[PDB]
Amino acid sequence: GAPPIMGSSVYITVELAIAVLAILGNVLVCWAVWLNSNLQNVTNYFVVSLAAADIAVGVLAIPFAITISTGFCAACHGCLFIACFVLVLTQSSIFSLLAIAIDRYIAIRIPLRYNGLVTGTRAKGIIAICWVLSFAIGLTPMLGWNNCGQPKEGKNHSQGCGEGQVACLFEDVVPMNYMVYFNFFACVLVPLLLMLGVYLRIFLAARRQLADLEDNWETLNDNLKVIEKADNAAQVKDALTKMRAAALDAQKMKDFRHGFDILVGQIDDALKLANEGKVKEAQAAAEQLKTTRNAYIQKYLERARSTLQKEVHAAKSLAIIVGLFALCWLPLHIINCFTFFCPDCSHAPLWLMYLAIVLSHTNSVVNPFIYAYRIREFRQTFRKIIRSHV
Ligand SMILES: CC(C)CCC[C@@H](C)[C@H]1CC[C@H]2[C@@H]3CC=C4C[C@@H](O)CC[C@]4(C)[C@H]3CC[C@]12C
Ligand SMILES: CC(C)CCC[C@@H](C)[C@H]1CC[C@H]2[C@@H]3CC=C4C[C@@H](O)CC[C@]4(C)[C@H]3CC[C@]12C
Ligand SMILES: CC(C)CCC[C@@H](C)[C@H]1CC[C@H]2[C@@H]3CC=C4C[C@@H](O)CC[C@]4(C)[C@H]3CC[C@]12C
Ligand SMILES: Nc1nc(NCCc2ccc(O)cc2)nc2nc(-c3ccco3)nn12
Ligand SMILES: CCCCCCCC/C=C/CCCCCCCC(=O)O
Ligand SMILES: CCCCCCCC/C=C\CCCCCCCC(=O)O
Ligand SMILES: CCCCCCCC/C=C\CCCCCCCC(=O)O
Ligand code: NA
Numbered sequence: 001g002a003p004p005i006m007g008s009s010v011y012i013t014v015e016l017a018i019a020v021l022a023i024l025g026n027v028l029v030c031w032a033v034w035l036n037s038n039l040q041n042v043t044n045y046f047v048v049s050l051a052a053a054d055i056a057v058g059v060l061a062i063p064f065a066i067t068i069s070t071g072f073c074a075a076c077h078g079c080l081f082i083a084c085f086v087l088v089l090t091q092s093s094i095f096s097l098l099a100i101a102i103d104r105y106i107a108i109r110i111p112l113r114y115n116g117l118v119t120g121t122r123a124k125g126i127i128a129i130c131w132v133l134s135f136a137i138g139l140t141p142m143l144g145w146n147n148c149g150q151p152k153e154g155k156n157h158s159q160g161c162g163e164g165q166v167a168c169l170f171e172d173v174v175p176m177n178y179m180v181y182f183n184f185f186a187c188v189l190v191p192l193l194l195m196l197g198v199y200l201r202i203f204l205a206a207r208r209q210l211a212d213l214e215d216n217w218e219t220l221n222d223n224l225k226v227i228e229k230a231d232n233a234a235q236v237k238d239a240l241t242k243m244r245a246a247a248l249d250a251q252k253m254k255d256f257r258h259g260f261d262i263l264v265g266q267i268d269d270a271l272k273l274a275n276e277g278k279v280k281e282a283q284a285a286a287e288q289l290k291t292t293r294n295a296y297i298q299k300y301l302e303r304a305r306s307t308l309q310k311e312v313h314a315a316k317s318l319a320i321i322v323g324l325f326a327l328c329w330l331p332l333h334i335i336n337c338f339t340f341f342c343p344d345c346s347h348a349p350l351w352l353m354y355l356a357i358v359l360s361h362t363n364s365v366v367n368p369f370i371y372a373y374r375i376r377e378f379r380q381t382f383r384k385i386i387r388s389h390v
Pocket of ligand 1: 060073074075
């Protein structure tokens with residue numbers, strides 16, 4: 001058996017490296033939001049809370065991980081805090097991710113009522129609540145759901161731990177049934193699936209709105225040909241009554257509102273001509289709607305389409321964050337399920353256990369990178385902060 005300090009020297013070195021990268025990267029995220037007003041929106045206040053949890057992973061959780069890797073003697077309940085504090089940070093990260101998902105879904109469904117519903121004051125209140133709930137969920141083993149009353153006295157006596165002390169090891173003090181059912185299934189897996197559902201609703205909402213935009217645009221043009229090729233004024237009337245319905249519904253910034261008053265107004269003039277039996281007068285009047293189309297409606301069509309495909313891109317990037325979170329944390333969870341559900345399976349090897357632990361901590365390094373590559377606003381603010389200062 002190779003000396004244990006050798007493998008542990010690699011682990012601790014890798015742990016410290018990740019801590020540096022998690023602190024630096026997420027400190028850069030928080031500094032960009034504080035600095036750039038374009039990044040000071042409600043969505044980014046959850047990014048800041050998620051950035052705060054990653055900073056704390058390198059400042060506290062990783063130093064705690066290195067500690068518990070040594071099995072040092074400790075009062076079991078103090079050992080519990082060392083083991084479970086990271087479960088607080090990951091639980092807050094999940095609430096922050098979930099909050100972001102719901103934030104964008106409210107933005108895509110009811111943009112007109114978003115600014116009045118999702119305010120900064122309310123986001124701060126939600127963040128404060130989610131952290132309290134994160135501390136309660138993460139520190140639930142401290143409330144009694146622990147194996148401190150069932151100490152491994154064979155291991156405790158080995159390393160000469162005093163009265164009420166235990167060789168501080170994660171699996172000796174934290175009960176696996178909490179890790180699998182409560183922390184993974186209930187508190188991580190369920191919210192993650194909910195996030196999946198929310199983002200699938202964001203992409204569905206956007207796809208349906210881009211179909212609506214193109215459906216109303218094809219209606220304006222398809223049906224304009226119906227008037228050009230009309231034979232009687234009632235056919236020009238049956239066509240004009242559809243665009244006025246499609247125009248009033250599409251009306252739901254100063255000159256987009258202006259062009260829609262011209263369009264509905266022009267439809268009302270050609271519709272009146274059609275009611276008076278003026279088929280050709282209504283046709284010429286309807287040809288004036290093509291002036292309003294190009295000068296106004298064509299511009300609102302590329303503005304609403306651009307805003308929606310901006311929301312799809314932003315939603316994709318933010319979904320990549322949730323996927324990478326799952327990617328980095330699932331291995332640790334999945335191994336726990338094997339230790340728990342398969343007592344006949346040989347425990348995962350120590351090198352894989354700490355590879356999974358390291359992988360889970362690497363998630364605290366990746367988020368600043370996704371922002372620097374996907375969100376132009378964050379990227380430009382990073383190049384500005386770094387060119388100016390560091
Ligand atoms: C405000 C923050 C940043 C300060 C850091 C405080 C941390 C490091 C403190 C708070 C509670 C502390 C623990 C409380 C109890 C015990 C049991 C003892 O037998 C070994 C030390 C141990 C496990 C302590 C380790 C250090 C600890 C985790
Ligand atoms: C989330 C994505 C990346 C998938 C991750 C799946 C990983 C964690 C899976 C794939 C194969 C799995 C291993 C398959 C078989 C064994 C042998 C058993 O005696 C202990 C568990 C152990 C060692 C498993 C641990 C978890 C494992 C490594
Ligand atoms: C996020 C998505 C992937 C859902 C997560 C599915 C998880 C919970 C699944 C994927 C693989 C599964 C494991 C596959 C094999 C075994 C060995 C068996 O003797 C006990 C159950 C156990 C240990 C399963 C537990 C549940 C498990 C870990
Ligand atoms: N099972 C587990 N173990 C550890 N550390 C102990 C590694 C170990 C496991 C077995 C052994 O004989 C010696 C050492 N940290 C752990 N963290 C988690 C975890 C955190 C979040 C979700 O799962 N699970 N987990
Ligand atoms: C609001 C921060 C205070 C601590 C929150 C405790 C979290 C546990 C309770 C969860 C239910 C939601 C809490 C809402 C309390 C404030 C309600 C309000 O004043 O509008
Ligand atoms: C901003 C400060 C960040 C943290 C600074 C301290 C980092 C030191 C690294 C890990 C702490 C490990 C302490 C030693 C473990 C206990 C030793 C033992 O009991 O055997
Ligand atoms: C960001 C800060 C959020 C507010 C933090 C305070 C909320 C605390 C919530 C519940 C704590 C439950 C754990 C109590 C364990 C006590 C330790 C022990 O058992 O000895
Ligand atoms: Na911890």
